[PDB]
Amino acid sequence: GSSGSSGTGENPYECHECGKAFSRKYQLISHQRTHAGEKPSGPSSG
């Protein structure tokens, strides 16, 4: 279909890696676990 029903309204907890959003703090931490493994390319790079 063509009905993009997003689910982002009250999410005071957003991931500082990708940009996800969660209702509670833990709800976010559990996600960050996926990023855990290697550091991205920030400083000293493009």
Binding site for Zn ion (CB under 5 A): 15, 17-18, 20
Cβ 27 to Zn ion shortest distance, Å: 12
Cβ 41 to Zn ion shortest distance, Å: 16
Say which residues have a Cβ less than 8 Å from residue 10's Cβ, sequence separation at least 6.
23
Instruction: Give the Cα separation of 3 and 11 in Å (integer).
Output: 22
Instruction: Give the Cα separation of 42 and 11 in Å (integer).
Output: 26
Which of 13, 15 has the CB closer to Zn ion?
A: 15
Cβ 9 to Zn ion shortest distance, Å: 19
